[PDB]
């Protein structure tokens, strides 16, 4: 039955990614006085299927200068980790219940970076190398702030167990307790997924296509799916951490729905930001994350360490 | 007679400094732009449902060329060749002979739509309103050779779009 | 072993997608198509040439900052001790030292590039 659970957590996520592509296109269109995909299927509902079939029926090209092994391993690592980072998510019950699921998520994200690195390096192109170096610089800028903010907001949780987040927020969303950390975490998640004002690894208007410039057909589809799956997963993480939802143990559907709606709202805000701001310069991205967030993240880490002790509100260990 | 963009110093009042700090920390202008594009989200999109809906056009539109005929049914083209002489792209090729009736009728009237600049100079130079850029603009072909129009192609085009071409001439000839 | 099963399933699914991608479509390859992309023109030099990092110091310090983040992770459990005074003083000491290192790097123009 566990294999059935694995399939019921992977296939629906891939379908959600496929339709999130269409949702993003239509949202951008309607925010640009346009109409998203509207011909292929009713209201464009068949566009993702057409895109997938085109990509997987498209000839994939293997660059002559490319290192084949890494060039093929990178896409696999990207998708596998994108699908794996959903394993510990509590909705309301996690598939795999870890005492340290949060650190597992951090480690899985840190590994996913190497997909962009190796894809860029192995592509053996100047634009791909620039994209890989930009990914390196991006992960240099956000990782420390990401971990510090996550630690500070989990100091009121009592452990790194993700399921406990539901209990901690049983009377109040944790965003009412750490909204500056919430803002900084949201921006860090934007930077991490190579997303709005931080689309520097891909850089459509500056690097043609970034690290995936030499990728076509299937592998390109896998990188896109991994990117959007990471988007949805990170938005789900933001939902569980700050926007807690009521969980009736006898009717888990209530939580599931509330959770899904919050994640959808966060993804829609991701697209909203994508169609509202110009792109950063990765020098400015690193300067922001190192000189405006990091000092403030350290200060708020001090504050959230001292607060439970000074208010006698240390959360339970178990 | 001139204006200074920028060149505006900020007030350093404690209230103004606090407002600027709040803008910096709480991202007020970013939320302002977010609200702007959110408002644009709920607008009605300006898309038209092509090909079921077609964009606005005017009687002066310069589209596919066509050789018109007199109400009698005879060609208006009397082979004066000044439409060929005025064509800035030298797309028109004209050869003429005295027809069996003895009239000035072209034997060859070839225009390569692949060289024409759709300037209209041809329809403006013609003294008998024979060559006329009609209203058709959707005549894309799968091969290059189909765009090298013959006299037969133009005559056929004229007979097909005459009703519309005439109506457009009637609507616009007073401005010409 | 369940986590191993999940990892195996994900890896197998990804590799199967790769296999289908590389064996379903009709393949027609020639030298020009597989050439590196340089916006339509031939590249001048190799892409494996040195690429200078203008933020090398930032990375070397990000190493130690990641170290400090590793040191700070046990904090949620550290609050469960009876010596809250000593624990709090040591945690604030580590955070103060991290801030001091950041400040030293900032003032000595280390966070700047080039």
């Amino acid at each position: 039955m566990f294999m059935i659970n694995i399939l019921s957590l992977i296939i629906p996520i891939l379908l959600a990614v496929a339709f999130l592509t269409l949702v993003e296109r239509k949202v951008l269109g309607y925010m640009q006085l346009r109409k998203g995909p509207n011909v292929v299927g009713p209201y464009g509902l068949l566009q993702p299927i057409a895109d997938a079939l085109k990509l997987f029926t498209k000839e994939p090209l293997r660059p002559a200068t490319s290192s084949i092994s890494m060039f093929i391993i990178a896409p696999i690592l990207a998708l596998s980790l994108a699908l794996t980072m959903w394993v510990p998510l509590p909705m309301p019950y996690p598939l795999i219940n870890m005492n340290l699921g949060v650190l597992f998520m951090l480690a899985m994200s840190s590994l996913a970076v190497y997909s962009i690195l190796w894809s860029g390096w192995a592509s053996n192109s100047k634009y791909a190398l620039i994209g890989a170096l930009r990914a390196v610089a991006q992960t240099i800028s956000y990782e420390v702030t990401l971990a510090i903010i996550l630690l500070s907001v989990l100091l009121m949780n009592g452990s790194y167990t993700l399921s406990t987040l539901i209990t901690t927020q049983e009377h109040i969303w944790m965003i009412f307790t750490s909204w500056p950390l919430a803002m900084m975490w949201f921006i860090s998640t934007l930077a991490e997924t190579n997303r709005a004002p931080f689309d520097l690894t891909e850089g459509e208007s500056e690097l043609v296509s970034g690290f995936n410039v030499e990728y076509a057909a299937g592998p390109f589809a896998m990188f896109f799916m991994a990117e959007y799956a990471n988007i949805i997963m990170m938005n789900a993480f933001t939902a569980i951490l700050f926007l807690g939802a009521s969980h009736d143990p006898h009717t888990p559907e209530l939580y599931t729905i509330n959770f899904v709606l919050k994640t959808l709202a966060l993804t829609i805000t991701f697209l909203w930001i994508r169609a509202s701001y110009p792109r950063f310069r990765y020098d400015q991205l690193m300067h922001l994350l190192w000189k405006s967030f990091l000092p403030l993240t350290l200060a708020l880490c001090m504050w959230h360490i001292s607060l439970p002790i000074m208010t006698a509100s240390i959360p339970p260990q178990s | 007679t001139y204006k200074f963009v920028n060149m505006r110093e900020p007030s350093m009042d404690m209230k103004s400094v606090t407002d600027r700090a709040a803008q910096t920390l709480l991202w007020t202008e970013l939320v302002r732009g977010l609200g702007m594009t959110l408002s644009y989200l709920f607008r009605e999109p300006a898309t038209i449902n092509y090909p079921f809906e077609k964009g606005p056009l005017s009687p002066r539109f310069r589209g596919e060329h066509a050789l018109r005929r007199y109400p009698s049914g005879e060609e208006r083209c009397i082979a004066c060749k000044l439409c060929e002489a005025v064509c800035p792209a030298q797309a028109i090729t004209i050869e003429a002979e005295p027809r069996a009736d003895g009239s000035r009728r072209t034997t060859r009237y070839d225009i390569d739509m692949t060289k024409c600049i759709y300037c209209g100079f041809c329809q403006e130079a013609c003294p008998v309103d024979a060559i006329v850029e009609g209203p058709n603009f959707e005549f894309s072909t799968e091969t290059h050779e189909e765009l090298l129009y013959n006299k037969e192609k133009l005559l056929n085009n004229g007979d097909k779009w005459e009703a519309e071409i005439a109506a457009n001439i009637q609507a616009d000839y007073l401005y010409r | 072993m369940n986590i191993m099963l999940t990892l195996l399933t994900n890896v197998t699914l990804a590799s199967l997608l790769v296999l289908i991608a590389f064996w379903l479509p009709q393949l027609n390859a020639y030298s020009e198509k597989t050439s590196p992309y340089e916006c339509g023109f031939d590249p001048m030099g190799s892409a494996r040439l040195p690429f200078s990092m203008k933020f090398f110091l930032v990375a070397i310090t990000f190493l130690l900052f990641d170290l400090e983040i590793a040191l700070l992770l046990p904090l949620p459990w550290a609050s469960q001790t009876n010596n809250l005074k000593t624990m709090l003083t040591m945690a604030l000491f580590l955070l103060i030292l991290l801030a001091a290192s950041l400040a030293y790097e900032w003032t000595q123009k280390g966070l700047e590039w080039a």
Binding site: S292, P295, L296, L298, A299, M302, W303 | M14, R20, A21 | -
Partner: peptide, 26 residues
């Protein structure tokens, strides 16, 4: 005198650091 000028200037040019030192100090 000098403190007020410094703090007003600090929160006018670098308001981020002013909050961080205040939060850290508390």
């Amino acid at each position: 005198g000098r403190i007020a000028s410094f703090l007003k200037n600090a929160w006018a040019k670098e308001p981020v650091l002013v909050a961080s030192f205040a939060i850290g100090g508390l």
